[PDB]
Amino acid sequence: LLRRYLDYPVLWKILWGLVLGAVFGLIAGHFGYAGAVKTYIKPFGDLFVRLLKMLVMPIVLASLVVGAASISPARLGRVGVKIVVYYLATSAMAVFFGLIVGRLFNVGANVNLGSGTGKAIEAQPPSLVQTLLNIVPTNPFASLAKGEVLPVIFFAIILGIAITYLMNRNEERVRKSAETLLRVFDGLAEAMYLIVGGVMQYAPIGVFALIAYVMAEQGVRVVGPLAKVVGAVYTGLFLQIVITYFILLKVFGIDPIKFIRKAKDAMITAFVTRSSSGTLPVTMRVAEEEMGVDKGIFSFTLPLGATINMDGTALYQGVTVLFVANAIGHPLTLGQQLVVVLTAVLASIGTAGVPGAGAIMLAMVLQSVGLDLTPGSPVALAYAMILGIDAILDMGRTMVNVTGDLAGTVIVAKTEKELDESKWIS
Amino acid sequence: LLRRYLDYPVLWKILWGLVLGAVFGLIAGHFGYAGAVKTYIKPFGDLFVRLLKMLVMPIVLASLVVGAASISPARLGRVGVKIVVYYLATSAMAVFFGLIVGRLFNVGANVNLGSGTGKAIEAQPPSLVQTLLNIVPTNPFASLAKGEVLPVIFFAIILGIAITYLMNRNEERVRKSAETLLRVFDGLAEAMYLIVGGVMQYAPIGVFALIAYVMAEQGVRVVGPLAKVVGAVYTGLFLQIVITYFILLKVFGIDPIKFIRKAKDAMITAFVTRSSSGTLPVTMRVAEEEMGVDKGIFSFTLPLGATINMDGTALYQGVTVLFVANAIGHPLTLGQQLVVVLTAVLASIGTAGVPGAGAIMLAMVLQSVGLDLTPGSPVALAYAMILGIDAILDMGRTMVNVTGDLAGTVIVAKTEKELDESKWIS
Amino acid sequence: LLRRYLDYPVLWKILWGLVLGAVFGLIAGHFGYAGAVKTYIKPFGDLFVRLLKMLVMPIVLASLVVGAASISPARLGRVGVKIVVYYLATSAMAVFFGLIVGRLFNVGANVNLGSGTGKAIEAQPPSLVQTLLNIVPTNPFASLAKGEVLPVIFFAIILGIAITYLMNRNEERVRKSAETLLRVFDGLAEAMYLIVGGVMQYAPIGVFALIAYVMAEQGVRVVGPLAKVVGAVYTGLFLQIVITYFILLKVFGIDPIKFIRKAKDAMITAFVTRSSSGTLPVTMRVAEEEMGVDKGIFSFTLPLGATINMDGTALYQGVTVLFVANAIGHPLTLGQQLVVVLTAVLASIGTAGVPGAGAIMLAMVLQSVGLDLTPGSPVALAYAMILGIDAILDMGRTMVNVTGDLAGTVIVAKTEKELDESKWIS
Numbered sequence A, B, C: 001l002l003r004r005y006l007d008y009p010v011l012w013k014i015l016w017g018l019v020l021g022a023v024f025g026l027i028a029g030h031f032g033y034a035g036a037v038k039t040y041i042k043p044f045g046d047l048f049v050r051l052l053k054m055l056v057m058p059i060v061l062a063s064l065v066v067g068a069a070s071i072s073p074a075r076l077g078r079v080g081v082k083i084v085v086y087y088l089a090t091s092a093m094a095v096f097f098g099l100i101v102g103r104l105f106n107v108g109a110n111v112n113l114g115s116g117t118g119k120a121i122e123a124q125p126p127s128l129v130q131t132l133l134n135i136v137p138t139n140p141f142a143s144l145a146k147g148e149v150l151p152v153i154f155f156a157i158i159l160g161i162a163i164t165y166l167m168n169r170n171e172e173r174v175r176k177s178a179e180t181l182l183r184v185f186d187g188l189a190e191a192m193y194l195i196v197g198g199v200m201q202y203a204p205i206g207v208f209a210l211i212a213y214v215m216a217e218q219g220v221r222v223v224g225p226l227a228k229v230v231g232a233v234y235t236g237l238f239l240q241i242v243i244t245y246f247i248l249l250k251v252f253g254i255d256p257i258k259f260i261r262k263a264k265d266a267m268i269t270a271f272v273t274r275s276s277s278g279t280l281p282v283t284m285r286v287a288e289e290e291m292g293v294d295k296g297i298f299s300f301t302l303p304l305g306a307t308i309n310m311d312g313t314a315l316y317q318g319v320t321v322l323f324v325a326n327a328i329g330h331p332l333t334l335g336q337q338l339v340v341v342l343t344a345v346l347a348s349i350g351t352a353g354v355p356g357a358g359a360i361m362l363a364m365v366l367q368s369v370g371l372d373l374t375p376g377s378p379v380a381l382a383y384a385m386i387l388g389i390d391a392i393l394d395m396g397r398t399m400v401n402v403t404g405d406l407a408g409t410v411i412v413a414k415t416e417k418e419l420d421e422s423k424w425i426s
């Protein structure tokens, strides 16, 4: 197994590791070894989750610069508008679908938390203008060294536009200086893609361990409200993939049933790794090999959509907010519905392509809309039972995130006439 | 539409923006729209301030490394000693002007502000040696993140000197590596200059918004002895321009009237944007096109003196601390005034080149007169009105700061015989 | 005269610094002047510690990147991986011998300059696995900012390996971008080596000031424990040679006495010239003649060996970290005695060629093990002494470095059957 392992195709490796981890977790729960797997196996899962975070800031700083500097600034404006309007519209529709399914399945209806009416009057703090300001970084190095991906995306796009303006300057000193800066960033982006492709070789172990621990420990609590919220979130993600992307691809002229069988390379790799930004190379190659989108369009829309376009995270937050609110004996309202429609999206735009950041930004959206939790509050008792099925729904959440990443680049490229129609026919 | 506005020559549209903002603020104070302006108009000003602060660490680090690495070791040492003794001399003389002006105006006396002086009487020096040690960055990346300007200036200078020493090695691998590092930093500085060009093209709207909000809210509040502060600060500035610069220019030979005629471009573009590191391009342009100064002088002095040389911040700090100390009813003795001078100089250096930074650094000199910034105390009740007038105070501050940086560059140039004397002839 | 100051050997200069520091401190403490040396003198020796901490993080990141880019599974053949595994293994065992002998001699036991029993008593030590998977950084820029050494050594090694894997790609843009990124990091490492040269030139004054303040405020017996640290390091080096190689050499089937009775020509000149890189010519000469190793592999094992295989420096760090940890008061624990091993080995993988590499690679280990070097704490006072006797430890640790390189060459030659066994008869 010295190289039979490392040579095996990484997709089938992860897809095998997932099922082995599932069966092994169920068996370790059976034989009663929950603590055993929590002590001896989970450290490798945590190592994987920590490996998938050194590949978020370098790969979003050095890939946006190279993507935005490799486009004419006018085409960059046009493509960026066409793709950001799509990201926002689809995240909005995702939250809408999440709220619909959360109302339909009646998520968390019989939780029996003993909390009749905790708190709902603080539903509307969602500072909008302050966030649209916070996109701009008061200090770019602070936004890098603190973990905020949206300010560093803004600064990286600005730097890319500046470099592509420099590379057309009369002097030769500034021309070569800007070319060298762009080459530094190109080298960094490529080195990060290579490190990600190397971490993926360890992924068939660090996802084995993660799902082994999840199955072992929380394989029994998915019976009532938890099974209902899992069913709700996954039916919502299915509804999204079947309605939103399919309508958007049919109204433009892209066979959805073909787009899916083309994206099945990245859908899976994001489904099991649970990191829409650690599966970025597979997306940036499945959007160029199969779908044929030009290197100009995807190389900027995908490194941006990998972090700011999270339809699945929007949907998961929209469903779990309704869950935790029905868990405190007082559902949302119409006003609270639209408050979520905005706050969940303004949180999706922020959360990074990290395994299990949806839970953190979910706690954030709760601390926004009324349900403020203290370390002993009933809202906290309700939200704490979500981090159990965290992974079991994070998988589908990330799958929909990446599928949406792909069906936006395809739309933009089909509009811009940069879609190789020779690839879209059999 | 836009391209018409985008070509209207800036520095002649930003002034129109500022005057429209003054008119709008007065009209809003008339109709009592302070809240409407603060909620609709101010966010553009906040965005402009954040865009200005975004370009303070990268532009300083990059332009300073390039400047220090492009001159010489020895010529850099000489220019550095001359320009540092110049900045210290002018800051000291400016604080002396500030103190004598605050005394001559009887500022903050008839205000009969609270006399709660029971804990803020014991004055203490600023621990000078501790600051001179703080100049050395304990961790250069931590000093880039936390947004400290003097440690990053020190690291940039030492790195530039080291790169110049490297570029002379007999080897070739290390010479080419040094050239590549320096070209990275050159490209970064040039990209930051383009970004500042774009921000300053946006600056009409931002200036309109900021000064409109101010002249709406504080358009009626500056009637009483608070106008004494404006008179004092503006008199100190107007005379330090015509007593310190108009003498230091006649001792060395530069005709000061021609100096003003030539520096107008960088004067009325920093009087309205209130940022020294946001007029660094509109200063490095004038000190190369109209002043006629060698590139290897103003390419280091101006990025250096952008932050450490703040004569108007020093004068403003002196006058304002005198105002507060008179507001609580505690005068300053002649001996204590020297402590105030030294702390105002020390707070001029380590102040950011951003709008409204001296007011934030006003506490650093308020501590050295023994005063304390505890809430509810009269000290805060005067600091509030100071923060109110901060807008116009900072406009004047930055204008005289940039004029001082220009005059210091010109002095170092003429004493180095690099000042191209063919531009100073009628 | 300052040229004579810069011309005296940097290491033998710090020893006179330490000796005059001890003498001047004893005098000023016996004649009632402790305040004088603490207020006037001491800030020199504090600026020195600030200058040492300024250089750790850049010389860790930028040097590890180039180092790991010279040691890569993508440019290491069969002979390469053998010698690199041997180098890392023997450096690990050398740090372990250093820690063992430091525990045996009980170095720095009676220094007593520790403040008390504990400032953050028991420090809540994380589990061993929680500090084994705390090597991978969740954010590489945050680990640069917060000044963590292992989460940036790991990221730098990963980036370097990826960069080597790039420069062998069939493309041209990617290969060129990787070459440019490596040029950037090479230039940064060289600039840091220049700054380290300058700081170590300043180090006599800094060490003199630090030790003078120490001896003035409290008698700490600088002569006793240091006379024990030198003895402990030399016993560790003798043990390192005897055990670590005489075991390995006899395991791989080579007479150890027949190896030592030949390498004596290189050990002596490595002892005297104290520059392993400068001793490389005669090292290759002896490995050619006496060891009978063919040119094909000591043309590669010795050059690489004299720059990444620092067994003597590894043992020096292993012992002086124990000395510092036992001096400032709280002994060193397993969860830390393994971090010391990891950081010592993974920095030897990128050892700088400069007089003063042990000093930096010890400030780094004291920063990574959790004994932060800092301006004033007993860590700086117990680290200045080791920086003092650096010039006594160097003459032996260089001998151990060169003998380790020779033993590695002979071992790798035996495991591949290229021994001129006609040189090993009687």
Ligand SMILES: N[C@@H](CC(=O)O)C(=O)O
Pocket (backbone or CB within 6 Å): A274, A275, A276, A277, A278, A306, A310, A313, A351, A352, A353, A354, A355, A356, A357, A358, A359, A394, A397, A398, A401
């Ligand atoms: N980890 C997901 C986001 C989430 O699940 O919150 C992603 O990579 O986009």
Ligand SMILES: N[C@@H](CC(=O)O)C(=O)O
Pocket (backbone or CB within 6 Å): B274, B275, B276, B277, B310, B313, B351, B352, B353, B354, B355, B356, B357, B358, B359, B394, B397, B398, B401, B402
């Ligand atoms: N506005 C000043 C800063 C300050 O006044 O604090 C400047 O020129 O940067």
